[PDB]
């Protein structure tokens, strides 16, 4: 599977709910090529694809768990790209809303035990754990996150 297959798969439920424009995946892909989001955090690789502009109606987050790592170019420059297993797709209305989620995600991916449960729990358990953590962050809580926004790839 390619990064394009991942982005299209994670965008699909957000498109069906009208969280984002129908061509949202075309802009996420262009942004990922222009500014990669691959991150290495304690033995697990993470990517955070997102967009800038006016392609988002409501803030949302879509999570993908990869059985085998697929390479993403690094957020920070280096040879040997980042082998990613957890993808947090962000739908942010404005640049300011995305940074808010990036704050929260940084604490998330630095929580070792939390990240490793994501790699082993079922879709339903991933939802409950993530949705619970969202409820405790008042600067985020309104963000759209549903059972349909979790997928294994």
């Amino acid at each position: 599977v390619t990064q394009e297959d991942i982005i299209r798969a994670l965008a699909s439920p957000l498109i069906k709910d009208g969280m984002v424009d129908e061509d949202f995946a075309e802009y996420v892909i262009a942004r990922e090529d222009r500014s990669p989001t691959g991150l290495q955090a304690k033995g697990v690789g993470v990517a955070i694809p997102h967009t800038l502009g006016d392609y988002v109606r409501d803030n949302a987050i879509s999570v993908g768990i990869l059985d085998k790592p697929v390479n993403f170019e690094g957020w920070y420059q280096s040879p040997d790209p980042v082998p990613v297993r957890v993808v947090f797709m962000l739908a942010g209305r404005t640049w300011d809303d995305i940074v808010i989620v990036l704050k929260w995600l940084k604490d998330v991916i630095l929580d070792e035990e939390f990240m490793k449960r994501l790699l082993t729990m079922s879709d339903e358990e991933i939802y409950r754990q993530i949705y619970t953590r969202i409820s405790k962050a008042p600067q985020l809580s309104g963000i759209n996150f549903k059972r349909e926004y979790v997928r294994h790839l």
Epitope: I15, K16, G18, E22, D23, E26, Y27, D54, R57
Partner: antibody
């Protein structure tokens, strides 16, 4: 019945500013996504920009060569579309068209959306950038 | 960004011939293509959308076809009033690229 009447085009010096208008009638303007298309003398059509309806955010998008110089706005009380031009260059000389995008109904989302092909065009207004 | 390559740039054809204008997209555009006709001194008029659907009031001798990256506009039994320019356009996402255009001349 569907009519798109453009005005405001004319001669303007390089580096100057000019604002185009498009008066619409015969349809519900507040629900329509609107766009601008231009055509330099003897050349082909080129997409300029788009503005969404208010219920879809009312935000705009513009082509890269004019983004950061051009501004699109609408006034639903006047049923009018605007194109604001700044720092005009000779290569902006063109006939500018006002267009209405097609309406697509999204079953799963429940929202309407605009598709950027154009059945209805304005008559076009010529902008000349010259000293 | 999607690039549209429209061929040929100029076309000369006798009355009654079947004329074919082609557009090749830099990527798979999944039939998100429109065709336009522009007569001299007039604004463009839509002929085809969704690569194959004829617009309202368009004569049946026009037809669009294709898939993936390759598409064609066909004009059956060319008439002298068909003189003008023709344009394809990708319409799914920014920048909604128009092709370079085809200028049609009638041979007599």
């Amino acid at each position: 019945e569907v009519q798109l009447v453009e005005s405001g085009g004319g001669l303007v010096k390089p580096g100057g500013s000019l604002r185009l208008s498009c008066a619409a009638s015969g349809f519900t303007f507040s629900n329509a996504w609107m766009s601008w298309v231009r055509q330099a003398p003897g050349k082909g059509l080129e997409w300029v920009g788009r503005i969404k309806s208010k219920t879809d955010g009312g935000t705009t998008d513009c082509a890269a060569p004019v983004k950061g110089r051009f501004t699109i706005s609408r006034d639903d009380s006047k049923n009018t579309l605007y194109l604001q031009m700044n720092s005009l260059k000779t290569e902006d000389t063109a006939v500018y068209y006002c267009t209405r995008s097609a309406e697509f109904y999204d079953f799963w989302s429940g929202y309407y959306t605009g598709l950027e092909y154009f059945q209805h065009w304005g008559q076009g207004t010529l902008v000349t950038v010259s000293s | 960004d999607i690039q549209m390559t429209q061929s040929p740039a100029s076309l000369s054809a006798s009355v009654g011939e079947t004329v074919t204008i082609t557009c090749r997209a830099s990527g798979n555009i999944h039939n998100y293509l429109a065709w336009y006709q522009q007569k001299q001194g007039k604004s463009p008029q839509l002929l085809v959308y969704n690569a194959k659907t004829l617009a309202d009031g368009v004569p049946s001798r026009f037809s669009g076809s294709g898939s993936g990256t390759q598409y064609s506009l066909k004009i059956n039994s060319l008439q002298p009033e068909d003189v003008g320019s023709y344009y394809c356009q990708y319409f799914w996402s920014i920048p909604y690229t128009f092709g370079g255009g085809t200028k049609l001349e009638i041979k007599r």
